Symmetry: C2
Subunit: 428 residues, 2 copies
């Protein structure tokens, strides 16, 4: 019961990129983007009297309530009320690609698809699940990770999560355990999640470390394992030290292996301080035109059959600020500088000699968060005590670790927060 | 299966075994995580909340003034932060209030609190996730929206079974639905009820709704579990004396545990806000446990798919629900415009001069009407209308075309149908 259109797409992808086809889930194979009506509706645009549009319109555009239109500035009614395409507003796709190219000097436009707009990064992850993750596939990811990966990939998609450490005994970042995991990996397919800056540790690797990671992934690919390399760039750009500042997507795409499919998920969510906008992007690392076209068709079908399309007003808002808007650039830079100064205070406080008996920080240099391994006490007992007595909210990640978001603590408040954590530990 | 899902399932089984029996495999496995989310809500009343995955300062969330400048009347905390996965709680309340106002025979005790979705398609997708197994059957009219197939067949692997809703003479009939329900031979069905209809613009009378819901009750009592999806995309766009409550109300008032009504409605068409992506999902049940378990599972489904929906458009819909006087008048005017176009369409479609050209399917609502064209192929007609007459219409099937008066000014409608008649004569 596969649609002829899906079969057509599959055959084209098989001829041009058999490994990419082999990576598709069952849903991935069955998906396509329907013609018929869209083509009919498209053909109607050349007519004086277009009676095909499923929206209320009149002589000068869409019908709308002026009272709703009044809640926006700088956007035309056509940038607010109509449907966005399932793939997102085409201009936005262009402008976001331009931004990526600016941020990633070593990335070539020929080596990627045009970014497709998603309902932010979670939707991107869900789309990866739809398109490439079968029940009982394996997700390979650090033991320090975002809890929603499990709900997306295990609970929704039926995959297994296999974890590997990314910090050693002394709380310092290490690639050794990833390399060991890749060397022992015994299946013909893996989906890897790479999230740097990291939630929950706020670590971004050095170029040295990135090289090691991507060379290790290439070695796995060459052993006969197909690698879907999901690059979760939620905190991209929030870099406070001399680290690798391109996306790992670029490093991975520049390997030029047909057995590795890099997928970049990025967006406005944290980069543009726009969490509720729900504007993100999905980009494939491939130089093959057919692959680009078939994957775009399938993603369009996946989006159409899930949410139809994303929010036009917030897509339009993001589109506008991408057009070399120097004021917006400065505002983002200011905001990131605030985070960097908070990071700097956090570094000075967390590594002070007086707290060496209280915790061991995991390396951090980016993002929103850092984590500490609390000594001789339960992180859960510590958390509730901090809420009850000190009026401080922290996250207990696991049996040993606490996460603190310096993203929501003012610079002047940070020493108090950490000193209160140390006192709270000493209490128990 | 996660322990939390097992917990929810056991509670549902004890309180509403049939509702549990309706769940898909995904539906059974879903839950809403505690862990890190629970820890965050416990710290909401802390002075220093360092658990939030956002950037904040003393004033509230951090943001770019250039983006904030694109909105009026909304505060930044109504624009930039995350919405909850279930939607802004105030919006849920206000929409429920609207539903109650629109549906006098609906009791607040007999429904869940509406959950916000990314408009109605997301609602349909969620029904698919939660209740549709591969090879389940969707029972729906043969006149239907093409995306139902992509959502339920292509994405979810269900079969569509159609039944006619118009007789020989283009007149609406419940006879074929009753016949279909009497012969239906499986233990589960997912029905889709879409009135006003796409593509025919028909809404049934009180009389007809009674027949429909009595027939569905009879099927339920034979031992078939009925998920009754009420697609209210065009709700409120009523131009004749028809049933003006949602069919959700009629179905909920049956009080059968073997029928689970699910209402999908939203701002999309009701508020002339297609690109906003604000819709709602409501369950027809009087059982508190059912309400809580289904909400938990839907939250998990949303969290693992899109995370959350767009805050700015949710906040906008909230605002026009609260500050409503002017907005309500503007919407009323737009609907009056649609009514007048309908009235012209009726006057013209049934004029004697066109008796040989087509047979209209009954219509009284929404955006569209359909005609059965005499003696000519709709596709050939559609192409010829574009080429010679500069008229754009949709060819639905082997005999019918759809005309959207939603996008044709009142004074141009007679010309459109004049040209359709002329084009038909050209081809026969
Ligand atoms: C690592 C990581 N990925 C993805 C997300 C989700 O981002 P979004 O809000 O854009 O869906 C978050 C939260 C996150 O911390
Ligand atoms: C029957 C029907 N349901 C749903 C929709 C679209 O709903 P939404 O844009 O809110 O996802 C339309 C189009 C429609 O005609
Ligand atoms: Mg999958």
């Amino acid at each position: 019961a596969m649609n002829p259109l899906a079969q057509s797409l599959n055959e084209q992808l098989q001829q041009s990129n058999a490994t990419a086809f082999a990576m598709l889930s069952d849903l991935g194979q069955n998906m396509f983007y329907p013609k018929g009506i869209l083509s009919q509706s498209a053909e109607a645009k050349s007519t004086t009297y277009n009676a095909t549009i499923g929206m209320a319109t009149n002589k000068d555009g869409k019908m709308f309530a002026s009272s709703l239109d009044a809640m926006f500035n700088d956007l035309t009614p056509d940038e607010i009320f109509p449907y966005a395409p399932p793939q997102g507003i085409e201009e936005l796709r262009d402008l976001w690609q331009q931004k990526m190219l600016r941020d990633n000097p070593e990335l070539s436009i020929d080596n990627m698809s045009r970014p497709i707009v998603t309902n932010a990064l979670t939707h991107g992850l869900s789309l990866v699940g739809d398109l490439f993750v079968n029940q009982d596939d394996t997700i390979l990811l650090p033991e320090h990770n975002w809890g929603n990966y499990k709900l997306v990939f295990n609970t929704r998609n039926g995959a297994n999560l296999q974890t590997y450490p990314i910090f050693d005994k002394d709380g310092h970042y290490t690639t050794d355990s990833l390399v060991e995991a890749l060397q022992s990996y015994n299946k013909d397919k893996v989906i890897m999640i790479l999230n740097y800056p990291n939630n929950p540790t706020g670590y971004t690797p050095t170029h040295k470390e990135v090289t090691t990671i991507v060379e290790a992934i290439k070695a796995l690919a060459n052993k006969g394992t197909k690698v879907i390399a999901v690059v979760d760039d939620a905190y991209y750009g929030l870099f406070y030290e001399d680290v690798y500042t391109q996306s790992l997507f670029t490093a991975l795409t520049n390997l030029h292996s047909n057995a590795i499919l890099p997928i970049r998920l990025d967006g406005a969510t944290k980069e543009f301080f726009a969490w509720g906008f729900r504007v993100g992007f999905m980009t494939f690392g491939t130089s093959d035109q057919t692959t680009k076209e078939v994957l775009e068709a399938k993603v369009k079908g996946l989006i159409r059959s899930n949410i139809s399309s994303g929010p036009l007003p917030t897509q339009s808002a993001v589109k506008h600020v991408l057009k070399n808007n120097k004021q917006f650039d400065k505002e983002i830079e200011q905001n990131i500088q605030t985070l960097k100064e908070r990071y700097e205070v956090t570094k000075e406080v967390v590594y002070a000699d007086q707290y060496h008996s209280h915790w061991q920080a995991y390396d951090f240099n980016s993002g929103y968060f850092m984590a500490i391994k609390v000594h001789d006490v339960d992180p859960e007992a510590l958390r509730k005590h901090l809420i009850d007595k000190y009026s401080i909210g922290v996250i207990a990640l696991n049996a040993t670790d606490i996460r603190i978001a310096f993203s929501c603590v003012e610079k002047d408040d940070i020493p108090h927060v950490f000193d209160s954590i140390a006192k709270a530990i000493d209490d128990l």
